[PDB]
Design an enzyme around this catalytic site. Structure first.
Site, short mmCIF file in Angstrom:
data_model
loop_
_atom_site.label_atom_id
_atom_site.label_comp_id
_atom_site.label_asym_id
_atom_site.label_seq_id
_atom_site.Cartn_x
_atom_site.Cartn_y
_atom_site.Cartn_z
CG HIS A 35 5.30 20.45 41.32
ND1 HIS A 35 4.26 19.69 40.83
CD2 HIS A 35 4.72 21.50 41.97
CE1 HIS A 35 3.11 20.26 41.15
NE2 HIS A 35 3.36 21.35 41.84
CG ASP A 57 4.54 17.12 38.68
OD1 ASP A 57 5.37 17.04 39.61
OD2 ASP A 57 3.91 18.16 38.38
CB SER A 109 0.15 20.61 44.31
OG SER A 109 0.25 21.19 43.03
#
EC number: 3.4.21.90
Length: 158
Positions: A35, A57, A109
């Site tokens: 993402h 992901d 992230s």
């Protein structure tokens, strides 16, 4: 004690250059949250062929034969208690990784969660606030090397 460590964690920047996530060398691969749309701030790694894995992901490329030594080591055993990460302690309990509310957000992230011996136990993707804390959405592998992805209710991707 001086914190002299290899090059394992790399920044992922956006079009104008904001750091929107992180990429890491671990078990022979460079990996970053799918993402996270940006480029890996690294002259060699930003030129590798990344394979995608939408189910988890995760995006990844093979580490250059050289760098393969400058990497993290994973571990599939996480007893409950406290773990370490960039902003402090991470509590593992009830199969969930939680940090204080209002700590995690964009930029976080790709960041790993470590144990004291310096092994990676998980990789942060996002978090869902639950009262006084935030439940993290991480990626973790098992003893048979299988990728697993835990995502709490109402998780926002960081």
């Amino acid at each position: 004690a001086l914190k002299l460590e290899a090059d394992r964690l790399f920044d992922v920047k956006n079009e104008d250059g904001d750091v929107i996530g992180h990429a890491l060398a671990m078990e022979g691969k460079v990996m970053k949250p799918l993402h996270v749309k940006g480029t890996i701030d690294h002259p060699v790694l930003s030129k590798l062929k990344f394979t995608k894995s939408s189910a988890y992901d995760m995006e990844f490329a093979q580490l250059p034969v050289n760098m393969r030594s400058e990497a993290f080591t994973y571990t599939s055993e996480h007893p409950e208690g406290f773990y370490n990460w960039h902003h402090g302690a991470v509590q593992y309990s009830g199969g969930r990784f939680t940090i204080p509310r209002g700590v995690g957000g964009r930029g976080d992230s790709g960041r790993p969660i470590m144990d004291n011996s310096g092994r990676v136990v998980a990789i942060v993707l996002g978090g869902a606030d639950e009262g006084t804390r935030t439940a993290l959405s991480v990626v973790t592998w098992n003893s048979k090397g299988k990728t697993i992805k835990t995502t709490p209710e109402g998780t926002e991707e960081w």
